[PDB]
Scaffold this active site. Sequence first.
Site, PDB file in Angstrom:
ATOM      1  N   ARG A   1     -17.984   0.278 -13.370  1.00 32.47           N
ATOM      2  CA  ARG A   1     -18.514   1.406 -12.620  1.00 32.47           C
ATOM      3  C   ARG A   1     -19.270   2.355 -13.537  1.00 32.47           C
ATOM      4  NH1 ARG A   1     -13.187   1.986  -8.904  1.00 32.47           N
ATOM      5  NH2 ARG A   1     -13.956   0.949  -7.009  1.00 32.47           N
TER       6      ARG A   1
ATOM      7  N   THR B   1     -11.149  -1.371  -1.455  1.00 31.71           N
ATOM      8  CA  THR B   1     -12.207  -1.897  -2.299  1.00 31.71           C
ATOM      9  C   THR B   1     -11.933  -3.388  -2.505  1.00 31.71           C
ATOM     10  OG1 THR B   1     -11.139  -1.519  -4.451  1.00 31.71           O
ATOM     11  CG2 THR B   1     -12.279   0.333  -3.443  1.00 31.71           C
TER      12      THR B   1
ATOM     13  N   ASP C   1     -13.159   0.062 -14.203  1.00 34.18           N
ATOM     14  CA  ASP C   1     -13.560   1.424 -14.573  1.00 34.18           C
ATOM     15  C   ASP C   1     -14.825   1.382 -15.431  1.00 34.18           C
ATOM     16  OD1 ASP C   1     -10.544   3.174 -14.417  1.00 34.18           O
ATOM     17  OD2 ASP C   1     -10.563   0.983 -14.453  1.00 34.18           O
TER      18      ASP C   1
ATOM     19  N   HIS D   1      -5.664   2.983 -16.586  1.00 33.65           N
ATOM     20  CA  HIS D   1      -6.576   2.753 -15.471  1.00 33.65           C
ATOM     21  C   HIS D   1      -6.527   3.893 -14.448  1.00 33.65           C
ATOM     22  CE1 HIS D   1      -8.633   0.939 -12.079  1.00 33.65           C
ATOM     23  NE2 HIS D   1      -7.540   1.099 -11.355  1.00 33.65           N
TER      24      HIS D   1
ATOM     25  N   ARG E   1       0.833  -1.202   0.000  1.00 32.75           N
ATOM     26  CA  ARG E   1       0.000   0.000   0.000  1.00 32.75           C
ATOM     27  C   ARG E   1       0.870   1.254   0.000  1.00 32.75           C
ATOM     28  NH1 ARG E   1      -5.349  -1.180   3.871  1.00 32.75           N
ATOM     29  NH2 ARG E   1      -6.078  -3.004   2.684  1.00 32.75           N
TER      30      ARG E   1
ATOM     31  N   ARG F   1       5.488   8.651  -7.347  1.00 35.98           N
ATOM     32  CA  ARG F   1       5.044   7.588  -8.237  1.00 35.98           C
ATOM     33  C   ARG F   1       6.158   6.571  -8.427  1.00 35.98           C
ATOM     34  NH1 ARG F   1       0.692   5.713 -10.981  1.00 35.98           N
ATOM     35  NH2 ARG F   1       1.430   6.180 -13.101  1.00 35.98           N
TER      36      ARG F   1
HETATM   37  N1  LIG Z   1      -6.670  -2.942 -11.168  1.00 37.00           N
HETATM   38  C1  LIG Z   1      -7.709  -2.449 -10.336  1.00 37.00           C
HETATM   39  O1  LIG Z   1      -8.752  -2.011 -10.858  1.00 37.00           O
HETATM   40  C2  LIG Z   1      -7.551  -2.481  -8.839  1.00 37.00           C
HETATM   41  C3  LIG Z   1      -6.313  -2.816  -8.266  1.00 37.00           C
HETATM   42  N2  LIG Z   1      -6.158  -2.863  -6.906  1.00 37.00           N
HETATM   43  C4  LIG Z   1      -4.842  -3.245  -6.363  1.00 37.00           C
HETATM   44  O2  LIG Z   1      -4.809  -4.560  -5.870  1.00 37.00           O
HETATM   45  C5  LIG Z   1      -3.674  -4.617  -4.938  1.00 37.00           C
HETATM   46  C6  LIG Z   1      -4.094  -5.217  -3.706  1.00 37.00           C
HETATM   47  O3  LIG Z   1      -5.024  -4.518  -2.950  1.00 37.00           O
HETATM   48  P1  LIG Z   1      -5.379  -4.968  -1.482  1.00 37.00           P
HETATM   49  O4  LIG Z   1      -5.795  -6.441  -1.491  1.00 37.00           O
HETATM   50  O5  LIG Z   1      -6.466  -4.067  -0.948  1.00 37.00           O
HETATM   51  O6  LIG Z   1      -3.986  -4.786  -0.692  1.00 37.00           O
HETATM   52  P2  LIG Z   1      -3.595  -5.572   0.659  1.00 37.00           P
HETATM   53  O7  LIG Z   1      -2.416  -4.837   1.273  1.00 37.00           O
HETATM   54  O8  LIG Z   1      -4.755  -5.694   1.627  1.00 37.00           O
HETATM   55  O9  LIG Z   1      -3.130  -7.011   0.195  1.00 37.00           O
HETATM   56  C7  LIG Z   1      -1.874  -7.289  -0.292  1.00 37.00           C
HETATM   57  C8  LIG Z   1      -1.380  -8.638  -0.076  1.00 37.00           C
HETATM   58  O10 LIG Z   1      -0.244  -8.851  -0.872  1.00 37.00           O
HETATM   59  C9  LIG Z   1       0.632  -9.531  -0.047  1.00 37.00           C
HETATM   60  N3  LIG Z   1       2.017  -9.557  -0.474  1.00 37.00           N
HETATM   61  C10 LIG Z   1       2.919  -8.575  -0.294  1.00 37.00           C
HETATM   62  N4  LIG Z   1       4.110  -8.966  -0.793  1.00 37.00           N
HETATM   63  C11 LIG Z   1       3.962 -10.209  -1.286  1.00 37.00           C
HETATM   64  C12 LIG Z   1       4.817 -11.118  -1.911  1.00 37.00           C
HETATM   65  N5  LIG Z   1       6.205 -10.753  -2.131  1.00 37.00           N
HETATM   66  N6  LIG Z   1       4.356 -12.324  -2.300  1.00 37.00           N
HETATM   67  C13 LIG Z   1       3.062 -12.658  -2.087  1.00 37.00           C
HETATM   68  N7  LIG Z   1       2.209 -11.819  -1.486  1.00 37.00           N
HETATM   69  C14 LIG Z   1       2.633 -10.596  -1.079  1.00 37.00           C
HETATM   70  C15 LIG Z   1       0.444  -8.873   1.278  1.00 37.00           C
HETATM   71  O11 LIG Z   1       0.973  -9.662   2.282  1.00 37.00           O
HETATM   72  C16 LIG Z   1      -0.954  -8.754   1.347  1.00 37.00           C
HETATM   73  O12 LIG Z   1      -1.509  -9.893   1.927  1.00 37.00           O
HETATM   74  C17 LIG Z   1      -3.248  -3.220  -4.737  1.00 37.00           C
HETATM   75  O13 LIG Z   1      -2.163  -2.989  -5.567  1.00 37.00           O
HETATM   76  C18 LIG Z   1      -4.399  -2.426  -5.198  1.00 37.00           C
HETATM   77  O14 LIG Z   1      -4.049  -1.170  -5.558  1.00 37.00           O
HETATM   78  C19 LIG Z   1      -7.207  -2.589  -6.076  1.00 37.00           C
HETATM   79  C20 LIG Z   1      -8.461  -2.256  -6.610  1.00 37.00           C
HETATM   80  C21 LIG Z   1      -8.639  -2.190  -8.000  1.00 37.00           C
HETATM   81  O1  LIG Z   2     -11.055   1.922  -6.462  1.00 41.56           O
HETATM   82  C1  LIG Z   2      -9.836   1.852  -6.416  1.00 41.56           C
HETATM   83  C2  LIG Z   2      -9.136   1.883  -5.072  1.00 41.56           C
HETATM   84  C3  LIG Z   2      -7.752   2.525  -5.269  1.00 41.56           C
HETATM   85  C4  LIG Z   2      -6.979   2.716  -3.970  1.00 41.56           C
HETATM   86  C5  LIG Z   2      -6.598   1.671  -3.128  1.00 41.56           C
HETATM   87 CL1  LIG Z   2      -6.984   0.009  -3.472  1.00 41.56          CL
HETATM   88  C6  LIG Z   2      -5.889   1.947  -1.963  1.00 41.56           C
HETATM   89  C7  LIG Z   2      -5.551   3.243  -1.623  1.00 41.56           C
HETATM   90  C8  LIG Z   2      -5.921   4.281  -2.454  1.00 41.56           C
HETATM   91  C9  LIG Z   2      -6.627   4.015  -3.618  1.00 41.56           C
HETATM   92 CL2  LIG Z   2      -7.096   5.329  -4.650  1.00 41.56          CL
HETATM   93  C10 LIG Z   2      -6.969   1.686  -6.292  1.00 41.56           C
HETATM   94  C11 LIG Z   2      -7.735   1.659  -7.592  1.00 41.56           C
HETATM   95  O2  LIG Z   2      -7.042   1.548  -8.747  1.00 41.56           O
HETATM   96  C12 LIG Z   2      -9.091   1.740  -7.618  1.00 41.56           C
HETATM   97  S1  LIG Z   2      -9.956   1.710  -9.171  1.00 41.56           S
HETATM   98  C13 LIG Z   2      -9.938   3.420  -9.691  1.00 41.56           C
HETATM   99  C14 LIG Z   2      -9.039   4.313  -9.097  1.00 41.56           C
HETATM  100  C15 LIG Z   2      -9.001   5.651  -9.470  1.00 41.56           C
HETATM  101  C16 LIG Z   2      -9.860   6.121 -10.451  1.00 41.56           C
HETATM  102  C17 LIG Z   2     -10.754   5.247 -11.053  1.00 41.56           C
HETATM  103  C18 LIG Z   2     -10.802   3.905 -10.690  1.00 41.56           C
HETATM  104 CL3  LIG Z   2     -11.957   2.863 -11.485  1.00 41.56          CL
END
Ligand SMILES: NC(=O)C1=CN([C@@H]2O[C@H](COP(=O)(O)OP(=O)(O)OC[C@H]3O[C@@H](n4cnc5c(N)ncnc54)[C@H](O)[C@@H]3O)[C@@H](O)[C@H]2O)C=CC1
Ligand SMILES: O=C1C[C@@H](c2c(Cl)cccc2Cl)CC(O)=C1Sc1ccccc1Cl
Lengths: 331, 331, 331, 331
Positions: C168, C247, C165, C192, C98, C105
């Site tokens: 939504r 989320t 995206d 994204h 996180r 960035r």
């Molecule tokens: N593409 C999209 O539309 C979206 C992407 N995301 C992304 O998904 C990712 C995860 O989100 P959350 O589950 O909420 O984060 P989280 O922090 O709750 O979960 C992360 C997990 O990854 C694990 N991890 C860390 N290093 C690792 C390693 N070397 N090997 C295996 N596991 C490891 C952590 O221990 C943790 O359990 C984030 O990058 C988030 O931004 C989230 C929402 C939407």
């Molecule tokens: O909806 C989330 C949670 C966002 C997030 C998380 Cl998981 C943790 C901390 C901060 C943020 Cl912004 C990570 C992410 O990519 C999304 S999807 C999203 C983000 C920005 C604009 C439009 C969309 Cl559709």
Amino acid sequence: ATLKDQLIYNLLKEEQTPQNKITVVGVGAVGMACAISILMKDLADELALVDVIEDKLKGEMMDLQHGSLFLRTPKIVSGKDYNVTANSKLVIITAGARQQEGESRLNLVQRNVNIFKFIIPNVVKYSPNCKLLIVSNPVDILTYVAWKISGFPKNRVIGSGCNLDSARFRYLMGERLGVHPLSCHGWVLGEHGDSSVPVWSGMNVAGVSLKTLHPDLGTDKDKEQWKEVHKQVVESAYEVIKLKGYTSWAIGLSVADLAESIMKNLRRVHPVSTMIKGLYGIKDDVFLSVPCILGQNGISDLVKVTLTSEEEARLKKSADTLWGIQKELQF
Amino acid sequence: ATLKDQLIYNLLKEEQTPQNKITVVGVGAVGMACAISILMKDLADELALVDVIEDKLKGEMMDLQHGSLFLRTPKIVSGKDYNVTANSKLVIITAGARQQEGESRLNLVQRNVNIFKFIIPNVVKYSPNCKLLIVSNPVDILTYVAWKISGFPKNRVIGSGCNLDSARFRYLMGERLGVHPLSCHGWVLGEHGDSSVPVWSGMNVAGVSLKTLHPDLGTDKDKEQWKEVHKQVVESAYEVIKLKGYTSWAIGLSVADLAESIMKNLRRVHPVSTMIKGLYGIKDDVFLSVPCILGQNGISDLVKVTLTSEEEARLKKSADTLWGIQKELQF
Amino acid sequence: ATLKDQLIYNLLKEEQTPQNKITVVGVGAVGMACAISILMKDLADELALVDVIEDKLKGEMMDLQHGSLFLRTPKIVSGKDYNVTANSKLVIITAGARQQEGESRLNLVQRNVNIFKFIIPNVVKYSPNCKLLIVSNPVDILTYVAWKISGFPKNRVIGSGCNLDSARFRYLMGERLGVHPLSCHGWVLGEHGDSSVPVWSGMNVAGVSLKTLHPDLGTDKDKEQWKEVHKQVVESAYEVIKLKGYTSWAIGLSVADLAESIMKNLRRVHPVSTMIKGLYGIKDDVFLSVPCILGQNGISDLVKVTLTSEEEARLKKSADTLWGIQKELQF
Amino acid sequence: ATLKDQLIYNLLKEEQTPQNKITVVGVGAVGMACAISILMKDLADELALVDVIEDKLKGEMMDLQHGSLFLRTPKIVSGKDYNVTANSKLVIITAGARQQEGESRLNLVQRNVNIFKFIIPNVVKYSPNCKLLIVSNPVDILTYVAWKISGFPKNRVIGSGCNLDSARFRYLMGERLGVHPLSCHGWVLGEHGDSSVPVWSGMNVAGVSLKTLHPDLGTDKDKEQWKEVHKQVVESAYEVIKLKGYTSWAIGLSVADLAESIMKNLRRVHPVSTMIKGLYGIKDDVFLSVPCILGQNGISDLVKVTLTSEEEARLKKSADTLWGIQKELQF
Ligand SMILES: NC(=O)C1=CN([C@@H]2O[C@H](COP(=O)(O)OP(=O)(O)OC[C@H]3O[C@@H](n4cnc5c(N)ncnc54)[C@H](O)[C@@H]3O)[C@@H](O)[C@H]2O)C=CC1
Ligand SMILES: O=C1C[C@@H](c2c(Cl)cccc2Cl)CC(O)=C1Sc1ccccc1Cl
Ligand SMILES: NC(=O)C1=CN([C@@H]2O[C@H](COP(=O)(O)OP(=O)(O)OC[C@H]3O[C@@H](n4cnc5c(N)ncnc54)[C@H](O)[C@@H]3O)[C@@H](O)[C@H]2O)C=CC1
Ligand SMILES: NC(=O)C1=CN([C@@H]2O[C@H](COP(=O)(O)OP(=O)(O)OC[C@H]3O[C@@H](n4cnc5c(N)ncnc54)[C@H](O)[C@@H]3O)[C@@H](O)[C@H]2O)C=CC1
Ligand SMILES: NC(=O)C1=CN([C@@H]2O[C@H](COP(=O)(O)OP(=O)(O)OC[C@H]3O[C@@H](n4cnc5c(N)ncnc54)[C@H](O)[C@@H]3O)[C@@H](O)[C@H]2O)C=CC1
Ligand SMILES: O=C1C[C@@H](c2c(Cl)cccc2Cl)CC(O)=C1Sc1ccccc1Cl
Ligand SMILES: O=C1C[C@@H](c2c(Cl)cccc2Cl)CC(O)=C1Sc1ccccc1Cl
């Protein structure tokens, strides 16, 4: 510069071999009910149909394809030639000859052997590693026939056996008790059809044995006549035929349930026909239904059910009869 | 006491009405395909079948009942008497006569009207608040007839219309483009069957207009002859009939899709037949397919598709043709 | 003999290589939401979970296993060691760190790159022929990273990209129009998150373009301010984080939808991130979302959306920014 | 004319009530696991969420809403105020304190009884005809409490009870026997907690009694120590809690399984918390799990399990323990 080219850029053209393909051989009412049930359960990424009646076969294929918008099986194919069945995980046989009036059992069985002699080697050519599920009647003998011709190991040749008989039994049980059939447990085993055996000792709801509550259960001294449930299983089959001229829906749904266990490797237990040599004092190569664990290798295990003397004698009598017929067959 | 009393202790007697009941009227190939598809999609807690052929009806009911173990629809009933259809949320009519040798089109329509004169009042009597879904042909005329006889508001009278036409169109589109039909969007509207209209302007993948990319789309100067895709929709219908004698799986699947939107109040948009008076210069009481929003109260809204002049004139011709037949009908 | 040996007779002792296996790497909120959605859609015959937090990992695995009765996925495994992931068809990466307060960035990205340097080679070692689905953020960059490290061909590396995206956006569209999102079509493409691009020309219901009915659609002077819908898509993300801290459910469902297309070779079109070098004047190795055809070989084809001048410039600006970060990453 | 008015012609307005509304009270780990499981089983046409934490509540609601494209439940609502729950068919209560590592569910009584005193009257106010399904711990005691407070007939107040303990038991049994939990039958009754009772005498596969095959089954002299399986069931929540902090997925699945039987009127048999007065010489108004028939009126029947003298003793000990707690509660 075609429309498709303007709209779509191709990254690669490669491979494309089905991962979970199922074939249904014979597209009568039973085959097509198997097909629609399998399609509506998302079990296959490809479905192939085979029959010798080419018009009928093409029409059925097209009818299913036309419903593609509402399904998740992206490729449906058909043909008289077995190349369309290549690489099937599961091949379901419903093709066969219908018994004539006055026609002997041996004669009818021999006719189907001759039919399987064309079908089975072709299935094996194109899907050497498939599981075979035989639905064609008489299912127990024809499962033996498919096994004999295919050369497959015992685990990969499955007869639908008493699966439908047991499903009918559980429906009737549920009706009497006012409980969903899923929660009414009971097993019909041995030879599919007229000679099947209702195992009274295993009938239960929530693990409560009906026979234990009601010791007369199944016997002629039972004032509630529970024996009639098994009789109605047998009677209802002839009744449906008399009423609509064939059966389809229930067999189709039962076959799809077997296919689900096999395709998804569930290892659930179903009453299906398997090689029973070695059980119940049976020493011949005959197939009868016992509860079998079904998964991606077909029948990997079977359950050893404790039978009463009468239940054991009935399976043994069926085995003697089936072998009496089988030993006179010409392969 | 009885085995049932030893096993089960009752808290509640007072049974209740089924809350999501569906009836299918007519158990021909179309009706039964609707039935199996509805059962496998878990849309109803009770299904009723009605027909005038008593033996066929009972056998179909029993066959479905026998599959109850593999289903989640606890009650299946049937009968010649419409008391079995009481309290249906949705009533699907697939009943109809088959046009005979030498029989005119108008006379065939009148025979189906005479059947509806008996069916509709009976349905309305036992389910006064149901939605009617008309599949019987000619579907646009018979939907008008159901509306007229029932006295239901327009929202609760829905014709299958161009739902199957559109599904076939998208299947063919998907085959040409190598994309799943779910991702190939295109609408066939107006009069079901031979006179339906492929709306070229709405055909797209991913919101990318095929007509914008390929201006000649749907014309005779179309180098790729996409007109043939619509031609094939109509051709395929007669071909399936020539090949297997009837059609079932695709229509059954498409009807179940409609039933899903209605029963689950989804408000998805489907091309179905609706009262279109006041649209496209049409001023008569006629039903034609436009995209409609489907939900709990039937057709709540309809999408007003922009049509080319040519396209509008086609619906208008269909409207004139339809009204000309309906004004001669004997109710 | 054991109770097992008394109950069950074994025909053969297994055991096939995994047939329809999925791995999820990272069992945080996003990983577990993917897992439960995949389990409830019956997409895998084996599910493997990996994480670096060993107690958490084991507890999540056990919790899922305890629900086995209600599922159709017979094998669920987990471990810190990637040997549990062997022979996966699809490997989903949700692992990340996180982002910290006041962190650039390039530095947040670098932290996730360091994680991927360990994860990717392990995944490849045990499933050299899998498809990779990257969810970890920033998803477009990390998909590029997974692509570079794995050495896989571009068809086998997919980023969730603008899938969520677009979901939504279609939910918000459906709310405005009072229509189910399934029937409300619209594509959010490009990078994204903050810089995504709503493609107004493709927004339609039943093939009726809103942009054509309402020329001002998505412009500044739009009396109905439809641009606010896409703004709400972006604001929604941050609001959910503000409200519940992360989320999970929506991303979980969207990923399972992608898995469905891949596992079942559906060839549906999804907005996902893919290697875009060659399109829209983009000449760098960057991954952006366009509509892609997903099937058993990952991304086999993509749709060439016609973009306006401003839409194209926004993609290019995104590509430039992405490359600017990537060209500085230490692998 | 707005864009919506241009695009869509309305036939009629007026809101309609939902047909299959479900409310979840508490959007914690359990509440949300129940929600997603129910949404993915298509059981509801409206889902309402209630909690006292207002931001968390809004966030969870929005997260589910964003997944709408992938669901078939057209309306999801939330609110601190119980008006959002009106006309619910089923109300699931998951609010309240959960046990920490090493803490008994029985240590949660004062906290959760106090919470129920506010929750239950509110639920009953807005959904006077709903079924109540209690999940909060200790679940048997809180089922009694909900019953007393609501003034509902006991058929409409159901505790999730031992459906989950039995699911765990069957999972572990299946692992020992190499059979899917679905095919392994065995019941855990009594307290959802430390004093639960494994009914060895009813355990079977395919109707074959394991106790008959193995008389020492479940006793201290059992060479295979099957009692350890029940011990694992007892310790299940504790282990999972020690590992990941709480349990959620398995109970979510269990609750959805119960909700499916209720909403679809299946009349399947599940062990759930209910009043057992009248069974096994028990005279007190105590709630704990026995097998019940579940349908649209909630618990319509209890199945009377024949317990061995030892099994019955343990169940009465469980009932004694629970009644000692229940009887001291003041309303
Ligand atoms: N593409 C999209 O539309 C979206 C992407 N995301 C992304 O998904 C990712 C995860 O989100 P959350 O589950 O909420 O984060 P989280 O922090 O709750 O979960 C992360 C997990 O990854 C694990 N991890 C860390 N290093 C690792 C390693 N070397 N090997 C295996 N596991 C490891 C952590 O221990 C943790 O359990 C984030 O990058 C988030 O931004 C989230 C929402 C939407
Ligand atoms: O909806 C989330 C949670 C966002 C997030 C998380 Cl998981 C943790 C901390 C901060 C943020 Cl912004 C990570 C992410 O990519 C999304 S999807 C999203 C983000 C920005 C604009 C439009 C969309 Cl559709
Ligand atoms: N095991 C069970 O519980 C049940 C088994 N059945 C059996 O299923 C079988 C089929 O049932 P129906 O569909 O009603 O029969 P059917 O005669 O209508 O269909 C059989 C199809 O097999 C085709 N066929 C014949 N020879 C062939 C060949 N050499 N190669 C490929 N196809 C060939 C026929 O053309 C025909 O279309 C019957 O034997 C029936 O008894 C039926 C109900 C239950
Ligand atoms: N809208 C569409 O896209 C399509 C419509 N259809 C139509 O569906 C209708 C039926 O299709 P099929 O199943 O092939 O016909 P079918 O003739 O095989 O079955 C019709 C059934 O209606 C029954 N029936 C006749 N009069 C009745 C009455 N007064 N009450 C109750 N039942 C009665 C018959 O007994 C028969 O069982 C036809 O009108 C056909 O044209 C067929 C395909 C597509
Ligand atoms: N019956 C079973 O087999 C299982 C029961 N549980 C029980 O379920 C309960 C919840 O567990 P978790 O969801 O993990 O807890 P949680 O702490 O994650 O969430 C509980 C929610 O209840 C809410 N809440 C508290 N008071 C409320 C009120 N007066 N009105 C409305 N909402 C209120 C909280 O604000 C919180 O959001 C616990 O008692 C737990 O022990 C957990 C697992 C299994
Ligand atoms: O239900 C049928 C139709 C039956 C049949 C057919 Cl398909 C065609 C002509 C005559 C008959 Cl009996 C073929 C068959 O095996 C069954 S199942 C069955 C049969 C007898 C007793 C019990 C059972 Cl569970
Ligand atoms: O596919 C059939 C069978 C057709 C039929 C039947 Cl059921 C019985 C006898 C003759 C015919 Cl043509 C009845 C019908 O409406 C259809 S759909 C259809 C028909 C014509 C053009 C386009 C379409 Cl999408």
